[PDB]
Amino acid sequence: LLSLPLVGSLPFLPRHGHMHNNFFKLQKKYGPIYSVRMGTKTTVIVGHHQLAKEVLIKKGKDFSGRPQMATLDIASNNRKGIAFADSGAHWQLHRRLAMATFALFKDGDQKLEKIICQEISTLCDMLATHNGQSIDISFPVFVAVTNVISLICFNTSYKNGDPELNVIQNYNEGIIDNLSKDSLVDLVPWLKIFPNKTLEKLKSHVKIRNDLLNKILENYKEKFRSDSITNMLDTLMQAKMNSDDSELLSDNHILTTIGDIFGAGVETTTSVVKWTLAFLLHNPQVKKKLYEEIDQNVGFSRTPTISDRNRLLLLEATIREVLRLRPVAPMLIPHKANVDSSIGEFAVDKGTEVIINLWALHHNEKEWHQPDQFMPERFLNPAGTQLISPSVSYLPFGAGPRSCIGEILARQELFLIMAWLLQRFDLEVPDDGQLPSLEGIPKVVFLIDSFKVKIKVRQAWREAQA
């Protein structure tokens, strides 16, 4: 009897299980590197730290491109900005200027610590009014980090109850949900095969965001002083007047860069905060010691500063541990080969798509002890007196040309938020018995199912007010 003709073949089922984990499972059969061909596009997947650092660092310039996608084109205004732009003059320029702006907050008046703590304070006040109740903390946190990133881009911040915050929240959730059904890595291109209204919806959410950026520019346009350079829109409008690289600083090119920064700044930070609280509800023992640590090394004489990350070591290890278990980007932003190159001495043609399975690096059992468990202790020496780096297979913020540019902002944000809340609130399981599911929801960002927290002001915090 003959075998039957085979038109196509995929190694696992679509839309079954998370993509980053189905790839990681295949490595038992095929090794840490393998490829898939979808028509003419060929995709290479990589799930070992040595091969990944070759792609990201050693040959980082050979694989610094970005593939083209229908949804990303719409959300990137046709591959402008940074995250979704291909490697070239536009991406080079805007990435540098964005990195350059972050320098404007090292210390002084707008010391990033000051801006951040200004909004955490307002955050804690609004939360303290819910003393005794179970709430979803997504939106209060959303507002806090929305204002930090707004002060950094525009030197403006939204007053309490500004409906424009709810409008931003709305299209942020619309874009994220239509950008990709699950992760950005989809074997089958479904939206080109079946009749669907996906791109129509994405265009309409994008339209509301873009029309909002145009209005924000036009007012700032008639307020820009070439001597005042206090934010990112200044840094970007400055470089424009100098070009008269004028072609790559058009109004849209600036629009899209601010967009990638405003977006990333809110959605990544908010997501990691929710993940952290969720893990601590499942891990009361760790939470208790976090209270102990912050009470011993900060007490209640003052509110926590960046300085405290030298003595609040367990809180640092908890943040590092969430970024390992539930990376914001378990497969990063897909890369592309700008030229013919190789990985582990394997041929890789120009234009090939390359994906680093960061989920695989963070769960490699030869590199981590019990990687499925949430053990912040793994980042502490056995005595708990100094942070460590237990595995080289650890890259929450990526590496190389395409690495995160908001890491400094991110780490300071996550630390100050968690330190202020733990100093001040008992964060307990709601009165109903429900805990948050840690399974997660893979989108362009690795989100968690929304959940509620019973929040109480700490008795230790009430005392010391006398």
Residue-wise DSSP of 320-349: HHHHHHS-SSTT-SPEE-SSSEEETTEEE-
Options 19, 26, 44, 75; binder of ligand 3NQ; rule CB under 6 A:
75
**97 is an interface residue for ligand HEM by CB under 6 A:** no
**87 is an interface residue for ligand 3NQ by CB under 6 A:** no
Residues 98-137 that bind ligand HEM (CB under 6 A): none
**178 is an interface residue for ligand HEM by CB under 6 A:** no
By beta-carbon proximity to ligand HEM, the closer residue of 20 and 454 is 20
**358 is an interface residue for ligand 3NQ by CB under 6 A:** no
**Rounded to 5 degrees, what are φ and ψ at 156?**
-130, 160
Stretch of 57-65, 229-237, 261-269, 273-281 contacting ligand 3NQ, by CB under 6 A: 261-269
Number of residues that bind ligand 3NQ (CB under 6 A): 20
Q: Which does 101 bind (CB under 5 to 8 A by kind): ligand HEM, ligand 3NQ, none?
A: none
**409 is an interface residue for ligand HEM by CB under 6 A:** yes
Q: Which does 409 bind (CB under 5 to 8 A by kind): ligand 3NQ, ligand HEM, none?
A: ligand HEM
What span, in angstroms and rounded, lies between the C-alpha atoms of 44 and 85?
20
**235 is an interface residue for ligand HEM by CB under 6 A:** no
Q: Within 10 A of 250 (CB to CB), how many other CB atoms are there?
A: 13
Strands 346-348 and 341-343: antiparallel
Q: Of all helices (H) and strands (E), which one includes residue 128?
A: helix 112-128
Strands 335-336 and 353-356: antiparallel
What span, in angstroms and rounded, lies between the C-alpha atoms of 238 and 234?
6
Query: Cβ-count burial of 261 within 10 angstroms (0-12 exposed, 13-18 middle, 19+ buried)?
Result: buried
Query: What is each CA distance from 40 to 36, 73, 84, 352, 373, in whole angstroms?
Result: 10, 20, 21, 10, 40
What span, in angstroms and rounded, lies between the C-alpha atoms of 135 and 127?
9
Q: Which does 248 bind (CB under 5 to 8 A by kind): ligand HEM, ligand 3NQ, none?
A: none
What span, in angstroms and rounded, lies between the C-alpha atoms of 409 and 112?
8
Q: In angstroms, give the least distance from the CB of 112 to ligand 3NQ.
A: 18
Options 26, 33, 83, 414; binder of ligand 3NQ; rule CB under 6 A:
83
**442 is an interface residue for ligand HEM by CB under 6 A:** no
Residues 333-362 that bind ligand HEM (CB under 6 A): 333
The binding site for ligand 3NQ (CB under 6 A) comprises: 75-76, 83, 171-172, 175-176, 179, 209, 259-260, 263-264, 267-268, 328-329, 404, 444-445
**Residues annotated as binding site for heme?**
404
